[PDB]
Design a protein around this ligand. Structure first.
Ligand SMILES: NC(=O)c1ccc[n+]([C@@H]2O[C@H](COP(=O)([O-])OP(=O)(O)OC[C@H]3O[C@@H](n4cnc5c(N)ncnc54)[C@H](OP(=O)(O)O)[C@@H]3O)[C@@H](O)[C@H]2O)c1
Ligand SMILES: O=C(O)CCc1cccc(-c2ccc([N+](=O)[O-])o2)c1
Length: 315
């Protein structure tokens, strides 16, 4: 099956196109190509600074009648500087305006860490520490629930929440809507078994981000581990007559995850979608899981003292 059922009753395509780091001059064509070759889920965020350009592509394909709005699954995320209850709606509305949509299929709290509101996405003190917000995440969640009730979003969820943070949302007094999704980093070097099992056991769908290990991350070092170049993964790919990237995308799919590889290269966008016609064996899956080394692409030193920093806990 190409979609997974969410706890709001909607179906979410298990493959989507990522857009973090997609240059604004290239992302419009990337999204157009993606839709042309079958993608029906785009992962966006205000902090990526390219939602207007993503929106241009979506709008053209809707106008062209290449795809109906009901067939698309568009995801965006509430940035850290908008956790205050009174800022949530405006942040969502700005994203809707940029994407040129009247609703989002899914809106995520991007990180559990709230930051001081202002123009800067990462407000810093004079010593380089991020400046936190005092807004309780449970209050941010209530504000997210209001978006469902106002028709701006069909589903709400969370991202980069650890198990205790997920539990805190699930245990919120007066909880109205459970989170539909937790979007987290996940790949063979950070397999996330514990957190995934917990989320799935609660009916929360997990989306795997950076499934290729984010080789274009700005802080990449030459000596870092590289999934795409791992000869063991290359060997599994060769056995199946697929590329290493295709194996890396298929892997989370077979764990009942959604996966959102990013590309702005038309040939790769197409390659990355050709993952529905082969199966990794259980042995392949266990072998890929065995490569776990708790290696994390996405975490910032500036945030490590924030009270809600998610990655101190084991999971
Ligand atoms: N919620 C969060 O906090 C969070 C954090 C990180 C990421 N995300 C989401 O997850 C998406 C994916 O993660 P990511 O962008 O970090 O990294 P990724 O999808 O793991 O890797 C993207 C990199 O892989 C390259 N690539 C793509 N397909 C390839 C292929 N078939 N062969 C070889 N190279 C290929 C891309 O190059 P080209 O583009 O040049 O083709 C790009 O450099 C993001 O774009 C974003 O939407 C969310
Ligand atoms: O958020 C995205 O989707 C991409 C930008 C990014 C990349 C890496 C890290 C953090 C980030 C935001 C907050 C923290 N933190 O460690 O608490 O890290 C944010």
């Amino acid at each position: 099956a190409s979609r997974i059922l969410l706890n709001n009753g909607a179906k979410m395509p298990i493959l989507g196109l990522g857009t973090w780091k997609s240059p604004p001059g290239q992302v419009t064509e990337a999204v157009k190509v993606a839709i042309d070759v079958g993608y029906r889920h785009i992962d966006c965020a205000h902090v990526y600074q390219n939602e207007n350009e993503v929106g241009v592509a979506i709008q053209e394909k809707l106008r062209e009648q290449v795809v109906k709005r009901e067939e698309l699954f568009i995801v965006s995320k509430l940035w850290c500087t908008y956790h205050e209850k009174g800022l949530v709606k405006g942040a969502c509305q700005k994203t809707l305006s940029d994407l040129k949509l009247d609703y989002l299929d899914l809106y995520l709290i991007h990180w559990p860490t709230g930051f001081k509101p202002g123009k800067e996405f990462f407000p810093l003190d004079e010593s380089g520490n991020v400046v936190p917000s005092d807004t309780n995440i449970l209050d941010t969640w209530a504000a997210m629930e209001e978006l469902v009730d106002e028709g701006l979003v069909k589903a709400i969820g969370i991202s980069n929440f650890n198990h205790l943070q997920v539990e805190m949302i699930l245990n919120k007094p007066g909880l109205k809507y459970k989170p539909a999704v937790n979007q987290i980093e996940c790949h063979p070097y950070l397999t996330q078994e514990k957190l995934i099992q917990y989320c799935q056991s609660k009916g929360i769908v997990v989306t795997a981000y950076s499934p290729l290990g984010s080789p274009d991350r700005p802080w990449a070092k030459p000596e870092d581990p590289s999934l795409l170049e791992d000869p063991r993964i290359k060997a599994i790919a060769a056995k199946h007559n697929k590329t290493t990237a295709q194996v890396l995308i298929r892997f989370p799919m077979q764990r009942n995850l959604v996966v959102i590889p990013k590309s702005v290269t038309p040939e790769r966008i197409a390659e990355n979608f050709k993952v529905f016609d082969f199966e990794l064996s259980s042995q392949d899956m266990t072998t890929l899981l065995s490569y776990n080394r708790n290696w994390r692409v996405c975490a910032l030193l500036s945030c490590t003292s924030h009270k809600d920093y998610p990655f101190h806990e084991e999971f």
